[PDB]
Design an enzyme around this catalytic site. Structure first.
Site, PDB file in Angstrom:
ATOM      1  CG  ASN A 153       3.394  -5.077   0.120  1.00 52.28           C
ATOM      2  OD1 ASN A 153       3.107  -6.183   0.152  1.00 52.28           O
ATOM      3  ND2 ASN A 153       3.655  -4.004  -0.970  1.00 52.28           N
TER       4      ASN A 153
ATOM      5  CD  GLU B 293       4.669  -3.677  -5.143  1.00 52.53           C
ATOM      6  OE1 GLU B 293       5.772  -2.786  -6.073  1.00 52.53           O
ATOM      7  OE2 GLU B 293       4.531  -4.606  -4.469  1.00 52.53           O
TER       8      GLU B 293
ATOM      9  CE1 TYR C 238      -4.143  -5.680  -7.211  1.00 51.12           C
ATOM     10  CE2 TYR C 238      -4.723  -3.663  -6.559  1.00 51.12           C
ATOM     11  CZ  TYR C 238      -4.331  -4.962  -6.343  1.00 51.12           C
ATOM     12  OH  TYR C 238      -4.677  -5.452  -5.233  1.00 51.12           O
TER      13      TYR C 238
ATOM     14  CD  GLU D 225      -3.088  -9.637  -6.727  1.00 46.39           C
ATOM     15  OE1 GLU D 225      -2.742 -10.871  -6.133  1.00 46.39           O
ATOM     16  OE2 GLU D 225      -3.653  -8.579  -5.865  1.00 46.39           O
TER      17      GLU D 225
ATOM     18  CE1 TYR E 195      -0.886  -8.535  -9.117  1.00 46.91           C
ATOM     19  CE2 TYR E 195      -0.982  -6.665  -9.392  1.00 46.91           C
ATOM     20  CZ  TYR E 195      -0.751  -7.590  -8.580  1.00 46.91           C
ATOM     21  OH  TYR E 195      -1.145  -7.978  -7.357  1.00 46.91           O
TER      22      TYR E 195
END
Length: 190
Positions: free
Chosen positions: A44, A177, A77, A86, A88
């Site tokens: 990740n 990502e 982001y 958070e 996006y």
């Protein structure tokens, strides 16, 4: 150059590169607001360039190429504090729509395409202030693209009308990502 996970400033831009330590990822800061990422059977990771702190009215321009092979996404982001959020603004993705299982809170037209808005909650997860429970706000572009201009104000205003408020802005970047996938990308921010 190629660098290990960390954060800092490069050619005038803030950058943040993180990975779970699995390996198979190569992140390179280039000239100006450019950065490249090549990944092969990675873990990740998230990496990109932008600003620290971001603003609620920034118009973000990005251009380049993005070729995911698996689970991955390209987005603006960032985070806000007090409340901790958070968020996006997803411009493109691979095999998985990252808003899946999320609660749809509306739609907003901006920069040539409609976006679907969603909210989700993260429980006891890592964050810029330590482990915590916070919400994630998403704006997911219907017409995918790898270059374009993002009027952040339109998204932040649409989220607010829906009750999705933001606190004090923290970093705000254009990032790539990956979650156990492969791909390549080369993006220039401005």
């Amino acid at each position: 150059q190629t660098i290990q996970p960390g954060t800092g400033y490069n050619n005038g831009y803030f950058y943040s590169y993180w990975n779970d330590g699995h390996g198979g990822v190569t992140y390179t800061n280039g000239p100006g607001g450019q950065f490249s990422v090549n990944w092969s059977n990675s873990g990740n990771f998230v990496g990109g360039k932008g600003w620290q702190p971001g603003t609620k009215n920034k118009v973000i321009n990005f251009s380049g190429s993005y070729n995911p092979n698996g689970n991955s996404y390209l987005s603006v982001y960032g985070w806000s504090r007090n409340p901790l959020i958070e968020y996006y603004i997803v411009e493109n993705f691979g095999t998985y729509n990252p808003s899946t299982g999320a609660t749809k809170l509306g739609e907003v037209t901006s920069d040539g395409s409609v976006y679907d808005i969603y909210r989700t909650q993260r429980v006891n997860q890592p964050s810029i202030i330590g482990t915590a429970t916070f919400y994630q706000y998403w704006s997911v572009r219907r017409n995918h693209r790898s270059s374009g201009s993002v009027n952040t104000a339109n998204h932040f205003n649409a989220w607010a009308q829906q009750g999705l408020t933001l606190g004090t802005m923290d970093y705000q970047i254009v990032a790539v990502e990956g979650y156990f996938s492969s791909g390549s990308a080369s993006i220039t921010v401005s």
